[PDB]
Amino acid sequence: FETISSETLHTGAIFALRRDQVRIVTREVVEHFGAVAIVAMDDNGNIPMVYQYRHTYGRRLWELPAGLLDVAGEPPHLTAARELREEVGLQASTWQVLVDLDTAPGFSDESVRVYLATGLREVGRTMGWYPIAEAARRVLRGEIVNSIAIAGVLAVHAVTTGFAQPRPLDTEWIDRPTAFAARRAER
């Protein structure tokens, strides 16, 4: 395939809308910053989750601590470590890559890197703590629907059961977004 022409329709606060012609076909893309989420597992197999209101659905959803990659030039896991601290007041000595997910491949370039933080330390000075098995059962019961949350909860669940393994921080993040950030539409 090949992009014959790109046309920017709208630039917003956190994303930009663009319309391209391909291969001929029309493809409207939503350029996003990209984001990072954290699955902080403690010594007893529990992870913290936040209950946040999502205007898109008009209700609160259970999710993993997460943030947008809106900090130009800042390393993803640095962003992730900051959000973990600010969201649930936790510092972690060990960071690994749990799972990368492309949220809506159909119309957006957003990709989210989910980290697995361990060696937890309570620092600083709404949310709840869930045993991984429960968080997982909550997913399968529809109580956790946020795609990022589902991916992280079930991934660490595969790890906690010995089925799979975490990964190094230098693991390549293939689809990390760059378009919107490259615009640098701020001043």
Ligand X SMILES: Nc1ncnc2c1ncn2C1O[C@H](COP(=O)(O)CP(=O)(O)O)[C@@H](O)[C@H]1O
C-alpha torsion angle, residues 55, 56, 62, 64 (rounded to 10): -100
Which option in ligand X, Mn ion, a second copy, none does residue 10 bind, with CB closer than 5 to 8 A by kind? a second copy
Nearer to Mn ion, 31 or 87 (CB): 87
- Which region among 42-50, 71-79, 117-125, 163-171 touches a second copy (by CB under 8 A)? 163-171
Q: Residues binding ligand X: what is the number (CB under 6 A)?
A: 11
Cβ neighbours for 152, distance < 8 A, ≥ 6 positions apart? 37, 38, 39, 64, 98, 99, 114
Nearer to Mn ion, 37 or 159 (CB): 37
| 134 in contact with a second copy (CB under 8 A) | no
Task: Classify burial at 116, counting beta carbons within 10 Å of its beta carbon; exposed 0-12, middle 13-18, buried 19 or more.
Answer: buried
Question: Which residues inside 87-116 make contact with a second copy, applying CB under 8 A?
Answer: 99-111
Calpha distance 150→142 (Å, rounded) = 10
DSSP structural state of residue 140: T
| 56 in contact with a second copy (CB under 8 A) | yes
Instruction: Report the first-to-last Cα separation within the chain, whole angstroms.
Output: 35
Cβ neighbours for 185, distance < 8 A, ≥ 6 positions apart? 11, 16
63 annotated ligand-binding residue: no
83 annotated ligand-binding residue: yes
Question: Which residues inside 42-101 make contact with ligand X, applying CB under 6 A?
Answer: 66-68
- Are the CB atoms for 123 and 169 separated by under 8 Å? no
Q: Is the dihedral of CA 28, 12, 101, 55 positive or negative?
A: negative
87 annotated ligand-binding residue: yes
Contact set with ligand X (CB under 6 A): 13-14, 26-28, 35, 66-68, 106-107
Contact set with a second copy (CB under 8 A): 1, 9-10, 12-15, 17, 19-20, 22, 26-30, 32, 35, 53-57, 61, 63, 68, 99-111, 136-137, 139-142, 145-148, 150-151, 154-155, 157-159, 161, 163-165, 167, 171, 174-175
Binding-site annotation, residues:
66, 83, 87
